[PDB]
Amino acid sequence: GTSNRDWWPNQLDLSILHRHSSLSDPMGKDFNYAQAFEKLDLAAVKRDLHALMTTSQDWWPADFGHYGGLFIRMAWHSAGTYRTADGRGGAGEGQQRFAPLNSWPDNANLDKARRLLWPIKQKYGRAISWADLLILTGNVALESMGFKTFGFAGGRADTWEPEDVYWGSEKIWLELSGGPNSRYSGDRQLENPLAAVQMGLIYVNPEGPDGNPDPVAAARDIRDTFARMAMNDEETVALIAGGHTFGKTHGAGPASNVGAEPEAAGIEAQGLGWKSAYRTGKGADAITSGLEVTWTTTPTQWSHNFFENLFGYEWELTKSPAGAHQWVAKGADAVIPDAFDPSKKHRPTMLTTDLSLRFDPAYEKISRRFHENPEQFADAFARAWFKLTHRDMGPRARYLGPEVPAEVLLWQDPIPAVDHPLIDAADAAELKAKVLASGLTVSQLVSTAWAAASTFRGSDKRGGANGARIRLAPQKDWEANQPEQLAAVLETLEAIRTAFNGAQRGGKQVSLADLIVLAGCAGVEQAAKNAGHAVTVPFAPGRADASQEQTDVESMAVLEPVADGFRNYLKGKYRVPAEVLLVDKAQLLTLSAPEMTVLLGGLRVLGANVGQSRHGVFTAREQALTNDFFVNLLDMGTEWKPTAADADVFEGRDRATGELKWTGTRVDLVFGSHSQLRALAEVYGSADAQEKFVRDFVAVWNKVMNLDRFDL
Amino acid sequence: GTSNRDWWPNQLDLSILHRHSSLSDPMGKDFNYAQAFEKLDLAAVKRDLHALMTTSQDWWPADFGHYGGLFIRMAWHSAGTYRTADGRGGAGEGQQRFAPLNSWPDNANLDKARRLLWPIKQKYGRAISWADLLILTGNVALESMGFKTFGFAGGRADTWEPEDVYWGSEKIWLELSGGPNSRYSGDRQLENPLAAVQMGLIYVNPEGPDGNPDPVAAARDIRDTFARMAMNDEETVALIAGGHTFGKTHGAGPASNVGAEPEAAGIEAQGLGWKSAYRTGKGADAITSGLEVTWTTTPTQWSHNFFENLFGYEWELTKSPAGAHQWVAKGADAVIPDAFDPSKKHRPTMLTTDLSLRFDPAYEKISRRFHENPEQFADAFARAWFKLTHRDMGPRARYLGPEVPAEVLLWQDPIPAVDHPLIDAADAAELKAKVLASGLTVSQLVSTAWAAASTFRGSDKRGGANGARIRLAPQKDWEANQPEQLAAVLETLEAIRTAFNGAQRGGKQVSLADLIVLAGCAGVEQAAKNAGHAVTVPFAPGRADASQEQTDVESMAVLEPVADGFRNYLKGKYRVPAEVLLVDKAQLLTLSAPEMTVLLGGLRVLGANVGQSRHGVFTAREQALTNDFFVNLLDMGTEWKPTAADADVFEGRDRATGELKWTGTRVDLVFGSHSQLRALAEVYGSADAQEKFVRDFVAVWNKVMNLDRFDL
């Protein structure tokens, strides 16, 4: 059947805003995962997982009689899709069990790992999510083989359909770089927001860059992709050598033996894939990557044998039974045990990418330190394994269960505890009146609260107004945040705060983080009053102020809005049309198409635009909350044309007289162009819509102010 | 960006079950269109629409100074997408304003017509839908130009995104037959469920079949496509001759002047398309179809001039100014007015498809009768226009406002009024005990109530258990309904009815329609009891029994289920795989994926399979309501393979011993295979899910029993 996407392959896709509907969710609308998890007997789950580690199924026999290695790779792959650029991927939604990730070549035979866990998932039911189980299983694998983990948090709710993610433009799995859809340009520059070298890989090609078995060149791809997944040199070395302390690769015969990935397989495979015609198809005959490497003398026990082997031998380029590049120890004894035959032993082997840890000069210093000091190695690995598997879980308030680490980590963007009484309804009314009496405008108050709250992204639950980090480096200097206007608003608000907190009894006080949001609420109420409408904007106190010392300035760079349609802002020119970037921004904010529409039309007439640009400001009563944006956009008395200067900017002229009435961007005019957005704009631009516009605008304003409020 | 559809273009699409969520809907979840429409001043709207008819806009000037013809085409095209095969298309959801229909070639310049209506839509807001306004505007155009309509119902709620319709497989607009995705095979057989001859046409090609100007062969396409839109010979002639009493076609210059359709046009076109470089690009210079035909000497007034011209001249094949085939009257004077220049007159002209009404022998007799009896033409056209424009609105109980015709029409599948007290909860408990004491089994009761209720489709709101049509021709004879078993159940239930109605005083009686659904509910109660669960199934009385004379046997044939995965039924072998037909059926029943999953798992263990097939009956306690289907399907102890005889039947064998445990169809095993369906099966197959399975099943059972209950 030919679809709208076939006919008009470049039209905006709004479906990404309407995923995760009550319709697709088999749980009741009242289902609370946290409430179910908090009654889970986690100790009983961990005992079942521990017994599973050494209970081989004949449909996928356990290497060395232990599934630990397989389950560590499973949990590492669940977490390893994460990109810092947009916070998409990671383990936080259990997306490994859906398309496309369930059928990525780098996830080959993790279908077997997930099937081994069905009996335990079945036993504990809704009290443990697949998303949590995949990570827990990884932890129990490590614990069962003598490794002390840093801890574990539950709270990853299951999802019921594929995340809409840009994974790249290539039309062939594992396509080498330099093709018609190359993710590389210039001097091997990987396109944002990608964090893997090839379509269907987690980070890098274990053979080396585009198959070239050079460990030095491979090191470059390792550093670049791992930085793009929030990992520095020390963390990267600890993770790779930590993982490759356990288990083995599978390359027993030619890859051409392996059949269809799960999403392409027959219905009778019942959700499994990569069926191999090679000998038994499994166990001693398994083919996964096409490499055949076993790193250590005890693949089912924690050791420091990975670095002993890395540094204790010289390495020779060789080929797996499948014809993949890999390395073997020159002049070595057969010291490595076979996975199935207790009478066979093998020489030490390494991947190109393992030799990166010795032949990259910066990696070599860390690898030597970890070699000489295996206790430093074990602590770095434990901290990195925690960070990897929790990086997208959001604030510490979301962390459930008895194994949550007490140590607060810089990477968590921590919020101090609140140790004092909160402001009540009468206090909030008093502070709103003081804000409005200071002379701060609707535009200053709405702009500032928008700038603070709109850094939130539901992809990894980073950002939001909690913390008041808008006052700190680097947020206070982001071009979109208008740093000089921002500094003047914050100076006034901080004087209001000091005066209010000075006058209080009983330790009651208000955070700047709360006052920034409450001020924006006053601005919206004033705008409604300006329009002749009395509304109360909801407000929930309880935000706290984080310090500069509790803020990683480098990690915060990825939250800079370089495109924000709701402020008619574009830092530079991009491949991607501005209207596509607007819908991407709405998805990160968790907004529906109706919520995006009403929010943007309101923000335009409140003066939220960066630099007080007139673009899209379709009103003669700026700083009044009206549906003017919609009534004026949909007026067929106005005709629109691109400017000679700039084809991304449109003039709206009286169709009769040619008089210039308005200017607008692609972000403004898409609401009068796109057939589904124009239908929404019509509802808000109708003569009966004033009360609905104000109500809906206040609702979506309050939603944005509260995105990071997991403390509630 | 490469998507799951790009990687796996044959996988099932579940997104069609999760459209029309609260997320995409700008209205509150409490919004009731019927209540809004009931408060509309319909008189005021019609005055505004009368005024609009002759208020010409410069950007699309009115032919003859009256938009009536354009608006009649607009309304005809809104209604004209309808197919009897699945009930999809039609005017009932206002889909002409969305992709792809807003951009079909046959809908060229109807973007101008919809834009002319924006001021009226704006003025009345949510109190009149686009869907109601398109039809009402058609009605007012006819009334303006002197034709009395049969009436008008409101109540078509607006929709907020495109409907998922199979319009065909061609990848080229207007592709002629015999291409690589031909909708024709054999002796010009049109594939079900399509009801148009080319991709992007409403019914037929106005030049003739694949552009060959033979009015006799064109008549064959007209008869076939109109039949597939529920219209017989009389209705077809009345509609074509009626429509083409008004207005004109547009082909003033070559089609190459005409630019991008609306979904392809620049953002500056603000939702309009087909911008033309020919002269002024509008009015006298307009290009829409490429044909240049004006039928009557009074194109803005009801006349008898269509059939006077048709029969009154001999016709000569000629070419429009765009190169299109059309016909001119031999030796005629210039009697037809110009649309713009009072000093120009034209000879009569006709389309190939107009001449069909004269040169097809069966049409010729109707056309001659209409020519000789113009009152019979006016009455037939008025009745056909009402049917065309209301065909997909469902039972008369949905019809709103003060212009609803009182006459009950056979095509409405009418239900008699209830004129008696209904059964109460005490009566319902008595009837259920009598049903269970009769000896009717769980399997008999569930199968019968499923057969009765599951004919409903939300596409045109035809079907359902109201009317007890399962006891009439043709439903009582349908293979899927198991005619011999059905006869036996109906006889027993009619004996219980006769005895209950005979014992009543005060006129109280129960309909067979009610008793069939109540007897199904008792069957589900009994099944729950068989499984040790205490369950009440909700029931709402008030169905009535329709007569055979109130049931058009030929119209009822299109509701026959030739595929029903819920009974593991396939009537023959189709090109579409059975799991695609299952999701298609779920969409028609208005089911979500979770609802489809629970229902099918339950029906399999209750014995609802046609012919008592063992396929998918994965329980050892048939007629007990359990989640056995899920627990057994997901059991990894079982391995599945297609049979020798039949690649569409699968055997489930113990992995260890090779013993046969189960058999299943594609419809059974897709729940074990598709990654999203398997995630749902797992919820219902978990150790904590027995009660949730029972309660979810009862909810979706009652939902199906109530689908056609608009009387509530």
Ligand code: HEM
């Ligand atoms: C440059 C980064 C990495 C590369 C290129 C890489 C590559 C690979 C490859 C090709 C395999 C073999 C797959 C098979 O044939 O079964 C594998 C196995 C494995 N990897 Fe990695 N890996 C990397 C990082 C990591 C990290 C960060 C972890 C965990 C902290 C990890 C843990 C494992 C484990 C446990 C296995 C063994 C699976 C088993 O026993 O079945 N890897 N790796």
Ligand code: HEM
């Ligand atoms: C065999 C079936 C039919 C064919 C092939 C057909 C074909 C056409 C074509 C090609 C046009 C010219 C479009 C243009 O260039 O602007 C037209 C116009 C029109 N048709 Fe039909 N039509 C059919 C049936 C109907 C029916 C059922 C109705 C209404 C009951 C209808 C009412 C109209 C009217 C009112 C116009 C004039 C538009 C104007 O004045 O702007 N037609 N038709």
Ligand SMILES: [Cl-]
């Ligand atoms: Cl639930």
Ligand code: NA
């Ligand atoms: Na994420």
Ligand code: NA
């Ligand atoms: Na329909």
